[PDB]
Amino acid sequence: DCGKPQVEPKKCPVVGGCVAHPHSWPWQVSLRTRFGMHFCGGTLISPEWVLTAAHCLEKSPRPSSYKVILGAHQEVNLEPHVQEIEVSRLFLEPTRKDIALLKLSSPAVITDKVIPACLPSPNYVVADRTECFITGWGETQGTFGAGLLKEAQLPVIENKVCNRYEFLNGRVQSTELCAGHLAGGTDSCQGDAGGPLVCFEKDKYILQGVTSWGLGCARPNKPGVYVRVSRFVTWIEGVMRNN
Numbered sequence: 001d002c003g004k005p006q007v008e009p010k011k012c013p014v015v016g017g018c019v020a021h022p023h024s025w026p027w028q029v030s031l032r033t034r035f036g037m038h039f040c041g042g043t044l045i046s047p048e049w050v051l052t053a054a055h056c057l058e059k060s061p062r063p064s065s066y067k068v069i070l071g072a073h074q075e076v077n078l079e080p081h082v083q084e085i086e087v088s089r090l091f092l093e094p095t096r097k098d099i100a101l102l103k104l105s106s107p108a109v110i111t112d113k114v115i116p117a118c119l120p121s122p123n124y125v126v127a128d129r130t131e132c133f134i135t136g137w138g139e140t141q142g143t144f145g146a147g148l149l150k151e152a153q154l155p156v157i158e159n160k161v162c163n164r165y166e167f168l169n170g171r172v173q174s175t176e177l178c179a180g181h182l183a184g185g186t187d188s189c190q191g192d193a194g195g196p197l198v199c200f201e202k203d204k205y206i207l208q209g210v211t212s213w214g215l216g217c218a219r220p221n222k223p224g225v226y227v228r229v230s231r232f233v234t235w236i237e238g239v240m241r242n243n
């Protein structure tokens with residue numbers, strides 16, 4: 001059952017936002033070096049497959065350089081039941097987009113704390129103002145929560161508006177989407193890249209974005225940019241089917 005957490009998440013009362021109800025985001029992964037250091041996020045989309053950002057793998061083209069942590073809440077004191085799995089193969093998106101697939105050495109064990117997120121239908125366009133969630137262990141820029149999994153509820157901004165001069169001035173492609181509060185203060189940041197942007201649809205969470213880049217973090221009029229997952233579903237499915 002993809003997209004359905006067992007520990008229901010909570011809204012807030014990653015820069016800003018709040019600490020996540022522990023294990024309320026069971027698809028969240030921590031992408032780490034062979035040495036145990038968190039540097040990027042990821043999303044479990046199937047027991048053997050993690051979706052992250054291509055730029056997170058810029059340092060090494062070697063699957064051995066990476067490990068995936070599943071089911072955690074703490075970044076340092078990993079809980080005992082935490083699943084730590086090596087990566088066997090890396091798949092960079094073939095058109096140089098900032099998205100990539102990780103095939104794990106062993107299929108993650110599905111538990112109340114480790115659950116895959118659902119994928120959207122091809123070419124779905126998250127509507128303007130849709131409130132979605134981003135999560136990760138990234139920088140907090142003095143906002144509390146360092147070391148614990150944080151979340152933020154952000155409104156999507158349609159590309160036509162996001163590309164205006166007042167915002168990102170034509171930098172955003174159709175294969176990306178924008179999200180964030182234009183007054184600033186709450187945003188994903190370095191360390192959250194490759195992590196999920198999920199939207200609640202009917203009764204479950206759908207992976208709609210991959211945290212990619214931005215002009216800084218939580219700055220006014222500077223929403224974050226995310227890879228538009230719906231434009232890569234067909235490629236993702238082909239990779240999982242043929243590998």
Ligand SMILES: NCc1ccc(CNC(=O)[C@@H]2Cc3ccc(cc3)NC(=O)CCN3CCN(CCCC(=O)Nc4ccc(cc4)C[C@@H](NS(=O)(=O)c4ccccc4)C(=O)N2)CC3)cc1
Pocket residue numbers: 055098171172187188189190191192193211212213214215216217218223224225
């Ligand atoms: N929700 C906020 C948020 C969450 C998470 C993050 C974490 N992710 C990062 O750190 C990314 C890493 C990266 C991602 C994609 C890339 C290259 C690098 N893709 C290409 O290489 C592909 C080639 N491409 C093609 C087209 N491009 C031009 C058009 C669009 C464009 O201009 N894109 C852009 C602009 C700036 C940067 C990267 C990309 C550098 C840096 N931005 S920053 O201002 O210096 C900064 C940000 C945060 C903190 C401090 C400083 C920035 O984000 N790096 C140029 C190059 C960051 C922000």
